[model samples]
Target: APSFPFSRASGPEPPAEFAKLRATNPVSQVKLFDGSLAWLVTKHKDVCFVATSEKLSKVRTRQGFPELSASGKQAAKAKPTFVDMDPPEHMHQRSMVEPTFTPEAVKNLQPYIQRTVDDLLEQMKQKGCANGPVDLVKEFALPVPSYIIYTLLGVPFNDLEYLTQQNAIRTNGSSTAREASAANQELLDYLAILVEQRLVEPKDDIISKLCTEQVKPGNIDKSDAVQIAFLLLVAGNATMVNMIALGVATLAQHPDQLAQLKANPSLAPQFVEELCRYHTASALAIKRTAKEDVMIGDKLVRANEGIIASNQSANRDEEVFENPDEFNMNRKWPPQDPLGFGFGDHRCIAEHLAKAELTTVFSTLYQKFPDLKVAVPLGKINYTPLNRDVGIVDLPVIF
Candidate 1:
């Protein structure tokens, strides 16, 4: 069996092996990074079923949850955030923070996101690379969504660098479990302090609101507030950084689509969806454990067997998209829900905010620098193939 997380043999696209698996063994066994075996579901329908199935629990700490690396094991056993919880407990804690990311709430956040993008763009133009190439991934993509998330979580703007570094170590598969756990502890302690500060004096941000509304009234404990912040702080920014960088490359690579978008700005929303569907970011994040004997497609997974649903591969299923390999922007608006943000209860809580940030940043970036292009050939760009989220390591650009 092919090892899981098949290499990006062709840059951003899922490996060709996925197509073979979808056609033949829709549910096939694969070896994980730690040499453990798990079921990998590749077909679009099968992936969706695994993602939404209650029998396949999302609780990573459970015995059979699939873990791709040492770092993943650390996170699985670490405190349960609403991201990894199941059912009543999941909804209970998730309900506390759901209000902040609701569509209406994200609508109010539009102006703020616009301002952040404007500010970052100006920085990119004037000081970043007036006469030289700028690493867009470092200079722009990494910060746009990050700064917004910092503001949302009541985190200090200055601590962005420190948090980013720690988060990288914690999430990077290269780190041993010990090193990753240490990095994770550093972040947890940092957030713990923020939670304490909020406990003392409430602010207008999510952390403060959680302290005031949930912690103070005994709806949840202070520890839960810290864990929630940790989850949002990490999940909200990292993948978006990848998406923004990849989105820029994807658009620039397809000049016709880029020109069409430039001529008609109304296509920004669709561009976001198409970009998301084309390059689904989180690969290993959709892990679960079969709580009981579950028949997923033609295969019967024994209770406690590990399962990984590759949304990355599923988005490219031939049965779903007409020209599954083409990066066309005009694809019919989801004959099925784009598995980009995930599905079911554990679906990304910040979907609306993520879409808003992506839409604004992309439309504004190209509008400001219509002649912008990748500084190097697409193949020469390095990609983080082993991380939970697959992304270009750095994207250099010239306007």
Candidate 2:
């Protein structure tokens, strides 16, 4: 048993468990990593329903809510962020940073995001030996998003190392549950300090914006602002890093699709979305607790029960996607929105930005390394093994 999350030791395909549950009982009971059984929602329609329901609260502090794993349960049981709160409170905090995620805002970031990608690629070009294995996950994938985050949140580049350390611990579910909680607290502490500094010396960044515009004006709580900053610092970067490295890995797994992408570069955005759906990084994201008993699909979830929304399984749902088992770039235009970015108000605040990161990184990568291929045998390549998100084990790629 590979824990609560269903993972494949080989191939980029969604776990076979997904198809099994989706076929018979979309909303069924399953065991989680912590040895506790909870309702596992796999159907696209049902997953969305649970995710968006007013009855399904995200307030992590509430008693009796379930978590996805031992570490996640620990996280949920710890400090709560806006992503963990419901309306009025969640709406207020989310609105504070909502402007930063606007389509135009994400669009304006393209130039800077691309610049970050190019700079990292240059670093790789100089450091990586010619025809020798280079760890793309480390050299190219991880830092691109890390630096982008540094620029986005206005964190000093000098402080990148520590923040990055905390981010790795927080996102890597394999980390000890208790330590992950400690990581969350440590990160929030750092962010709280950053926000206080911003309050004294305003800068042209999100932290300063929060301090001046929302935190000072009494529109948001100081602790909330710090927690929000910590959430962005971690969630924003982790998934994008996964996208860059795993996007390549999945493409390598599907050479035909990779060839098509190389030929028609414009399809990068949709192709990234396809990869997002296919891989569904943060496969166990968007967990919710029922505030009251309610009917979701065929299952009647009880109040105080926790529901795990499986974006991975939902994306591969046959009813929601045609040929869900296959990952072809030539799929129907306007592909159905996968829960990869999640659903509802608590949906990923950085959805558009993450897409932008993936699209630019993948497009530029193939353009730069048209002959990019895994250096080691597929089985030998390393990934962030045994975690919520599956990324390149160690992308030893050769151009």
Candidate 3:
């Protein structure tokens, strides 16, 4: 009954309603795309409960939980990243690629990340404050992650523009299905070429490691390597781009917090956590179908029904976050347990890397430009409602 484009509402007003619902019915059925109904779990407890619970299986092939049809299955199969799978198999696929994203591994990439952020900030500074409005998305957000991912995957750095375009088309969902499909094919083809090159002449990059390393003595194939690289390309780039953009926009709107961040640059870690909780880039957790009848809250989720846990809503739950709606950079208490990177076995493997990238960006931005402020009035800002990857269409900033 929430009407078309059944997304979790963004901005100021919705959190109150979400708080009420979280208290009254932590897990409730809601309308979804194409008028299909799906259970929406909102509270911190219930959201975490369903995410980690064994009864709420994530495997798509299982008949009981939300099983994608042949078409949906085909879509995932085409880009079969570890993100879409559930247990045993999911663990196996993730383990093969996990080492590359370990804290030490990610930390090693910090110098590159810092350099990327610094270079972008320098570009923004050169644009002149008199330019009045700057597209933060283009100048800062888009380039940082794009370059980092490119470096990580060992893709030619010159292809950043093309990859950004492909990602834009893929995320927008406004393109004709045919166009979208074609774009995906082109991206896959590119990934195949990269995988092939890495196999023949290995480098120190992640793609090279994935190609040469045996995932499971003879189990790993060139096709699997291609799929993993493709996944890393899309998921890795998309999530971090939004996180950095939204983090800046969120800080712009809350100048007091921005001032505090500038005052004590060491708060970068806590600030990143707050941004993850506040913005929650991924929107909803990956959809899972119940493998068996599951009791969540007061409702009976029969086997095969689609289950969506909204991380956006969970991050705002009043029970979990004190003064949940207000932006408090100092609310470092209760040790915020944001479900931003997700939970359980399927939790994002790139969390530490993402955090490092974000922290480096924020720390450098505030320290370098202490006077940064939004160039446009907050009221005039536009966000993509359909895409829960919440970010200003263009954030004009003056430093």
Candidate 4:
């Protein structure tokens, strides 16, 4: 039986045996929940095919993601976010919020992101004298993303701690199944109430815009607004939180690269891509189910079986990337397009915002603290078990 990758605390890097299998059986079967076998897509091209091909549907009207089946009760309440929908429906939903994440849109928020980073850095300096260790994950990495998302969603400043804690519970998945379910339900209920208030008292934030203007007159109901908010709150915070943490953790291991970034801050964009490739936050592409008996590389994925495209492996594929294991800031040829944010129709909508945020955070950190280095031994880091999003629970660093 194939072990459950998501259930393990260590991040999922395909086993060396799987690498040998990738050389031989790039596509293969592995046992899934309920004791059924499902296909695993490994090659970069094949993974992109499954991500972009119109023939493969993402909607759950048929067989929903199998992993959710592992959590039976919460599975029913799992609303179809745009990530789960195919084409036109996905396009429509994406269009409604695309403006909020556009380069221009994110540019407007750059100043705010910079200020947030500066404030965090000031606090870090105060907490630690001139050159003492600081927990980057807690002090800098986690809060920047959390505060940014909260500001974007118009979450009240006073209520930020409570909501963020709830989101932590939901993302950590360390609680009992019932506790996780309740946390999710509480989040949905809170968003529903927030959406209602936004309708009557619209503001400049994304949540208000979504609630008031996005849904055309006499069209989708209030429930749709709440669902989108729920999706944004969970996905928006979770992805970037881990990305920032991983970015810091990865950079700490490469001080020469860090010095390069410190010297040339304009390279922040390239650095972000390198970070995404070197230490991907979302290790697995969003779950995809086979629509028909389809050939993926050497294996035939039977219809309706769940398939997980390993972005982590694809990013490290030797065939596609030269010296795939090395962290090269200037990878002469980035993947035709990297799968770090995903691909095609379901590609991450917040790509620009995420890049903007990371760029701001990294640029500020390296510029302000030129000698920052990891204070803890790399081997002692504890990673979360729920997903492939790995990072130090507390990345101790000193400048």
Candidate 5:
């Protein structure tokens, strides 16, 4: 059995081992951090099959659900969010929040996101990167989505620093389990307060709407409402931070594509798509467990066995993406949507919002700072461990 989550260095590429597995044994058994084994699916088709298969369950609270690490096991003990729920329960919670991320809803959010981007860039300019290299991850990538999500969720901007601080500790690999748990509890408690406030006097925001529509009606409990908000925070905030940080770094690394994008602004949407596929910020998140015996590829995954669908590996499957290793902004026509947002019933509810944030940030960043360049060697940059989002720790840049 291959050891799962094969090591990666300080770059945006997936492990070299993934390609070999995809070619030789796409459905192979692999050992996780907990010394447990799970089926590791690497090929594009196999991953899609695993994602959409009803035989699999995403409920972490269930016995069969795959826990990648000790924290994952600890997470299993927590209240199940819509992200981990199965079937009608998943559909129920999803439906309640679905309206907030519709194309029309995202469209309405675009101008505000644009303004948010402009303000961040303007602040970066005002702070002056000339004095010293500014951390793009902190100044730009972190704030753009933070402001947007906080506003939409009715989370007070003043509380953003505390929330972001707690989130960083919770997600970073260096933090001990006790510290991570404490941060997680603090965030959950904070969100619970937000839900309670919304319960009484609702505002014109997503959480308030969720409260009025779901919590008050008793369709879902207040805790469910809190988990929904927490889901948005995890799914929307940090994921975008990583995507934006890595996307900017990737574009900077590829001058030819950057030139093309700078010349033609219309390529921003395609750039976002390609970036999502290329870096695949949420590479390791597509985890499921078999509720019944499911034949994946040539192997039989028995009941209660875990499966990890490597979206990063599938995004670079040679059969699916021609020149899979290259970052081609103008990839050939009829592009199949990448597995970045995942697939099936558990697909990311914030897809539209994520794309909007990504599109706006990627579209505006280069335009605002045409001369921006990575301040350090690409390899010198730090990366979060594979267990998290595989995100950049800090991206220092100078213009």
Candidate 6:
């Protein structure tokens, strides 16, 4: 067994092993963090082939669905979210919720998103001016998404401390499977309470819609209702917060790029696109398993074997992208049609909403603080502390 996720370095370079593999072994068996053999697909085309192929099973309950460790492997059999289900059932549940996050729907929410961003920024502005150095993670980045997700889910923003405390444990980089499960269970319980409330006083929020329309009507499982709420919470908050936290710190160091963005606000969308592609603070989406034997590039992934698709590597594939490492907001790229919001039938239901969120935050931040710059030595800043949203350990900043 190839016992490495390939060479890992504590820097921005994305496992250079990925580029090396794409150049040579596009699909090579490698040992996961769990020491299990898996076909690691590195090339752009090969990754897409693996991601969309029906021969692959995204269902976590499958015998060989890729799990990072023993604890992860065990959790695979837990509640099956739509992201964990396959067709028919996946489509059935996805259809009920997808409409809430459609392009038009998320677009309609942009006004509220803008207000939420401004409110958070305003609060942080007051605190930063008084407090000297504000940790962006706790002050700005973490709260923005948390508030937004709670607002959309119809949960009160005042409950953010509780929800975020539970989320922090779930998202911490050092969290064990037991830790993650406990945190997940806590949120699941909280969501269950919210679901129960929705059952009685159904509101205009997605959770309420899910309860009244799906759960009570026997359209979906009651536990699944809680699962959906939890899924939405994890999806809507953690990843988006990382997008903001790391994107800002990354761009702060890149004065030229930041300057270009500050000069032209409309570039926010492309900037967020590049931000999503460039960051390694999060996983490269979920690990995939071979439903049966399948060929990617020149290698055959055996049935019951797993495959890991490096969207991080695919986003940097030189064969497809010119100057793949260069962070250019306007660079023309092929994967524009291929965002991994959720990927396959499970791509992010809030794809457009996420884009809008980033657009507003990135655009408004610079305008709000044109002098925004890092307070600590960029090299000294810690990046590994955060779990799901890997970002600066403390983004000490001065406006």
In order, how many clashes per candidate? 0, 4, 6, 0, 0, 5
Model 2 compared with the native: what TM-score? 0.90
Counting only residues 3 or more apart in sequence or on different chains, how many pairs clash (N, Cα, C under 3 Å) in candidate 2?
4
Error of 5 at 250 (Å): 0.5
Residue 152 error, candidate 4, Å: 1.3
Please, what is the whole-model Cα lDDT of each candidate in the order they appear?
A: 0.84, 0.78, 0.74, 0.73, 0.84, 0.76
TM-score of 5: 0.95
Candidate 4 regions off by >4 Å?
4-18, 129-132, 173-186, 214-216
Model 4 C-alpha lDDT versus the unseen true structure: 0.73
Ranking by lDDT: 1, 5, 2, 6, 3, 4
Model 6 C-alpha lDDT per residue in residues 349-377, reported as the tens digit of each score? 77788788889999999899888877788
lDDT of 2 by residue, 147-264 (tens): 7776677778788767766767765657897877788778777788888899999987888898999889997778868767777877757778777878888788888988888998
Q: How many Å off is the CA of 360 in candidate 6?
A: 1.0
Clash pairs, candidate 1, are none
Superposed model 3: Cα runs more than 4 Å off: 1-17, 63-74, 77-79, 129-132, 173-182, 215-217
Residue lDDT tens for model 4, 1-399:
475353433442334543555588777766665676656777788888888766577766566354635454254356676766777788878777788888898898898889888988988877874556767876777788777787787888787667776777775656787777788888888878887888888877777887767654634578887887666777767778777877777776677888788889888889898877766677654567778777778677677877777776677777888887788886687536767888777778888888998999888887887777777777665555544355445567887
Over 180-287, each residue of candidate 1 has an lDDT whose tens digit, in order, gives 889989988988999899899888899998999999999889888888888897885778989999898898789999988998778989999999888888766788
Report the error of model 2 at residue 213, Å.
Answer: 1.9
Q: Against the true structure, candidate 6 has what lDDT?
A: 0.76
Candidates in order, TM-scores: namely: 0.93, 0.90, 0.90, 0.90, 0.95, 0.92
lDDT of 3 at 142: 81
TM-score of structure candidate 6: 0.92
Model 1 scores worst on lDDT over the 10 consecutive residues at 382-391
Candidate 5, residues 173-264, lDDT tens digits: the string is: 68897998899899889889989999999998888998898888888888878888888887757788899888888887898999999998
